[PDB]
Design a protein around this ligand. Structure first.
Ligand code: KAP
Ligand code: KAP
Lengths: 224, 231
């Protein structure tokens, strides 16, 4: 029972979506682990797993490498002078997390075709190895339709199942494009949730309630 | 080396706002200065109610006269929603191909600029700039940023081209900073491992005058590459 969580790009609200799904799943009595093998941009304050523990109360938080530079992992590794983890290292970590009645989320860094492991292995390759489906995090902004469609093509090209879309940030008030994009994205795939703009600044209690309301309970329960 | 028909390039981007139009102008300007006749074609233009006019921008920047449009929609949205909002239809596949085809002249370079990124719907149903490039046997020039997120977006776009056997003409960084930061510099080196980087237009290029823009454009591309596009 593994879902990778990937974005159409960087800064679409992916980590916060992982947290919101984790919270929703915890509230349906499901055990959650979140694995983020590679993390970059630590020295500017980024630790995505810690963000997920804080916001969602997840305790099973697995990772393998953290790079200080705010770059793609490969770039960050080349700059640090320290290789990336190995493909087998990543896959085995995720397989060991996997438990009955457990939702295991694997968060990429951040986009689908970013190299995560040696040599040139992507989150798509990992999804394939572990037979995971992919939840795609999207924006509601202009440009999202091309990015969503590009990602969904890349998924289907290697036969990784789409498990749906989440809009990482839903503006208030929406606007004509956001409003339109929401309908358009619902014609391309199932939108599992649209997280209210600003959800990242919520305390643990408000975040949990936002999460329980954001997802369809039956869908979430269904994952396991 | 007499080619009896035009060379066609579709000019696409990894997203919206990555500098496609200014790249079109720049390549158009460079190719003109090599003595190639250039047409620029924009079959679908949205945002006209907000002043958006990519063809006019190109004429302004490059002095290009041969500017072919077709559909214009007032709202600054994806073609499908702008059309629906205006109570208009999207063009048919055939009207796009015809607009491009009627520009044919021997030794001409025709640049076909899309709306937004590659998989934006241009014609109903789900006809995209990638489908058009297949129909007219065009290569695709892909405009990218040097910002974080670019490698994933570039590889997604390139994969989609390959999926339909549309040849990649190379990459163009639409806006290149002075000076380049660590991120920008490593992205450009990573971009060069994925594909030929044809040019990286100076940030602010859009605001140059005809004189400066022409000089910029001539320095920006390899003249062997530009010269070689019409045979
Ligand atoms: C710095 C930040 N932690 C981050 O999202 C890195 C993502 C990698 C994107 C690399 C690219 O596609 O250019
Ligand atoms: C409005 C502006 N003239 C423009 O570039 C339209 C781009 C549309 C992008 C559609 C999408 O992929 O979401």
């Amino acid at each position: 029972t593994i879902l990778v969580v990937t974005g159409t790009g960087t800064g679409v609200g992916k980590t916060v979506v992982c947290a919101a799904l984790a919270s929703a799943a915890r509230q349906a009595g499901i055990d959650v682990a979140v694995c983020k093998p590679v993390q970059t941009g630590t020295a500017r304050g980024d630790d995505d797993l810690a963000e997920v523990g804080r916001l969602a109360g997840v305790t099973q938080l697995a990772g393998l490498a953290r790079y200080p530079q705010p770059m793609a992992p490969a770039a960050a590794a080349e700059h640090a002078g320290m290789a990336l983890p190995a493909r087998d290292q990543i896959v085995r970590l995720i397989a060991d997390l996997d438990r009955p009645g457990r939702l295991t989320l694997v968060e990429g860094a951040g986009g689908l075709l970013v190299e995560l492991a040696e040599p040139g292995v992507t989150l798509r390759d990992v999804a394939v190895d572990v037979a995971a489906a992919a939840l795609v995090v999207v924006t509601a902004d202009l440009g999202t339709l091309n990015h969503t469609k590009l990602t969904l093509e890349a998924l289907a090209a290697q036969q990784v199942s789409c498990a749906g879309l989440v809009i990482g940030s839903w503006p208030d008030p929406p606007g004509l494009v956001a409003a339109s994009n929401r309908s358009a994205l619902a014609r391309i795939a199932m939108v599992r949730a649209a997280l209210p703009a600003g959800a990242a600044s919520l305390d643990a209690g408000d975040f949990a309630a936002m999460s329980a309301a954001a997802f369809d309970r039956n869908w979430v329960a269904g994952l396991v």
